[PDB]
Enzyme design. Structure first.
Site, PDB file in Angstrom:
ATOM      1  N   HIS A  16       5.368   5.386  -4.279  1.00  0.00           N
ATOM      2  CA  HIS A  16       6.178   4.206  -4.055  1.00  0.00           C
ATOM      3  C   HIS A  16       7.652   4.289  -4.424  1.00  0.00           C
ATOM      4  O   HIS A  16       8.369   3.320  -4.181  1.00  0.00           O
ATOM      5  CB  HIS A  16       5.590   2.998  -4.799  1.00  0.00           C
ATOM      6  CG  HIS A  16       4.211   2.625  -4.369  1.00  0.00           C
ATOM      7  ND1 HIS A  16       3.917   2.246  -3.079  1.00  0.00           N
ATOM      8  CD2 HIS A  16       3.044   2.595  -5.045  1.00  0.00           C
ATOM      9  CE1 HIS A  16       2.631   1.965  -2.992  1.00  0.00           C
ATOM     10  NE2 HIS A  16       2.077   2.170  -4.173  1.00  0.00           N
ATOM     11  N   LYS A  45      -3.640   6.731   4.672  1.00  0.00           N
ATOM     12  CA  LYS A  45      -3.406   5.440   4.030  1.00  0.00           C
ATOM     13  C   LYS A  45      -2.885   4.429   5.057  1.00  0.00           C
ATOM     14  O   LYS A  45      -1.875   4.694   5.717  1.00  0.00           O
ATOM     15  CB  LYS A  45      -2.408   5.578   2.893  1.00  0.00           C
ATOM     16  CG  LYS A  45      -2.312   4.304   2.036  1.00  0.00           C
ATOM     17  CD  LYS A  45      -1.531   4.519   0.745  1.00  0.00           C
ATOM     18  CE  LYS A  45      -1.478   3.217  -0.032  1.00  0.00           C
ATOM     19  NZ  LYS A  45      -0.611   3.362  -1.218  1.00  0.00           N
ATOM     20  N   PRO A  46      -3.508   3.256   5.197  1.00  0.00           N
ATOM     21  CA  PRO A  46      -3.077   2.366   6.285  1.00  0.00           C
ATOM     22  C   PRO A  46      -1.683   1.792   6.130  1.00  0.00           C
ATOM     23  O   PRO A  46      -0.943   1.722   7.114  1.00  0.00           O
ATOM     24  CB  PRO A  46      -4.156   1.274   6.307  1.00  0.00           C
ATOM     25  CG  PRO A  46      -5.367   1.942   5.760  1.00  0.00           C
ATOM     26  CD  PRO A  46      -4.861   2.934   4.723  1.00  0.00           C
ATOM     27  N   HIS A 131       1.895  -0.481 -10.613  1.00  0.00           N
ATOM     28  CA  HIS A 131       1.392  -1.018  -9.353  1.00  0.00           C
ATOM     29  C   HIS A 131       2.464  -1.921  -8.771  1.00  0.00           C
ATOM     30  O   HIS A 131       3.273  -2.491  -9.508  1.00  0.00           O
ATOM     31  CB  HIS A 131       0.147  -1.911  -9.521  1.00  0.00           C
ATOM     32  CG  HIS A 131      -1.088  -1.195  -9.974  1.00  0.00           C
ATOM     33  ND1 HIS A 131      -1.677  -0.188  -9.240  1.00  0.00           N
ATOM     34  CD2 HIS A 131      -1.868  -1.370 -11.068  1.00  0.00           C
ATOM     35  CE1 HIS A 131      -2.745   0.255  -9.881  1.00  0.00           C
ATOM     36  NE2 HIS A 131      -2.882  -0.445 -10.995  1.00  0.00           N
ATOM     37  N   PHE A 132       2.460  -2.075  -7.449  1.00  0.00           N
ATOM     38  CA  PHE A 132       3.111  -3.237  -6.861  1.00  0.00           C
ATOM     39  C   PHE A 132       2.187  -4.434  -6.997  1.00  0.00           C
ATOM     40  O   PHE A 132       0.968  -4.314  -6.865  1.00  0.00           O
ATOM     41  CB  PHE A 132       3.362  -3.057  -5.373  1.00  0.00           C
ATOM     42  CG  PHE A 132       4.595  -2.292  -5.048  1.00  0.00           C
ATOM     43  CD1 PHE A 132       5.793  -2.546  -5.678  1.00  0.00           C
ATOM     44  CD2 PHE A 132       4.544  -1.297  -4.113  1.00  0.00           C
ATOM     45  CE1 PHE A 132       6.904  -1.827  -5.357  1.00  0.00           C
ATOM     46  CE2 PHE A 132       5.661  -0.584  -3.780  1.00  0.00           C
ATOM     47  CZ  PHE A 132       6.835  -0.840  -4.389  1.00  0.00           C
ATOM     48  N   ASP A 133       2.760  -5.606  -7.202  1.00  0.00           N
ATOM     49  CA  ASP A 133       1.942  -6.799  -7.200  1.00  0.00           C
ATOM     50  C   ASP A 133       2.194  -7.677  -5.983  1.00  0.00           C
ATOM     51  O   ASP A 133       1.600  -8.755  -5.871  1.00  0.00           O
ATOM     52  CB  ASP A 133       2.100  -7.576  -8.493  1.00  0.00           C
ATOM     53  CG  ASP A 133       0.857  -8.328  -8.840  1.00  0.00           C
ATOM     54  OD1 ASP A 133      -0.216  -7.697  -8.994  1.00  0.00           O
ATOM     55  OD2 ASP A 133       0.954  -9.551  -8.951  1.00  0.00           O
TER      56      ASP A 133
END
Length: 134
Positions: A16, A45-46, A131-133
Site C-alpha cells: 500500500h 488480488k481484486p 491496515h487501511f480502514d
C-alpha cells in the site's frame, strides 16, 4: 493470508505504500506494481490502493486525527490532508498469473489502523500503520 515472512507493518507497506512513483501516471502502473503482491498470492488480488507519498508522511498519519475503526477496535487515524492515491482494480478477463488492472489515480484522506511495531520491524518507527480502514 499475510505471508508469514512479512510483519503486519511490512505487508502494509509492500501492498500500500509507493514513495518512488514516477510511473504512477501511466495507465500500466497498477499492472506493473501489483506483480510483487500477487507473487505471494494464489489468485490475482481484486482491488488494491497505493498511497504515493513519502514513507514518513504515511507513517505520520498515525499521529493525526483519531477516528473509530470500522471494526470498532484498535486505533485508526485519518490524514489531515488529502494524499495522492492510486486505486487498482482487476479486469474481468484476468486469471492468475495474468493479472491486469485498471489504474485510477486520485486524492483522498486516508484512514489507517496503527499499532506498536513488531520486534522484527525497525526500531526507528515505534508506531506504524498496519491496515487501511477505508
Amino acid at each position: 493470508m499475510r505471508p508469514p515472512q512479512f510483519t503486519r507493518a511490512q505487508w502494509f507497506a509492500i501492498q500500500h505504500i509507493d514513495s518512488d512513483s514516477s510511473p504512477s501516471s501511466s495507465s500500466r502502473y497498477c499492472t506493473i506494481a501489483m506483480r510483487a503482491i500477487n507473487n505471494y498470492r494464489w489468485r490475482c488480488k481484486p482491488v488494491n490502493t497505493f498511497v504515493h507519498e513519502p514513507l514518513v508522511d504515511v507513517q505520520n498519519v498515525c499521529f493525526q486525527e483519531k477516528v473509530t475503526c470500522k471494526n470498532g477496535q484498535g486505533n485508526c487515524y485519518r490524514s489531515r490532508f488529502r494524499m495522492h492515491i492510486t486505486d487498482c482494480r482487476l479486469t474481468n478477463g484476468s486469471r492468475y498469473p495474468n493479472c491486469r488492472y485498471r489504474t485510477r489515480p486520485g486524492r483522498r484522506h486516508i484512514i489507517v489502523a496503527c499499532e506498536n511495531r513488531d520486534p522484527r520491524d525497525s526500531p526507528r518507527y515505534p508506531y506504524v500503520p498496519v491496515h487501511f480502514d477505508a
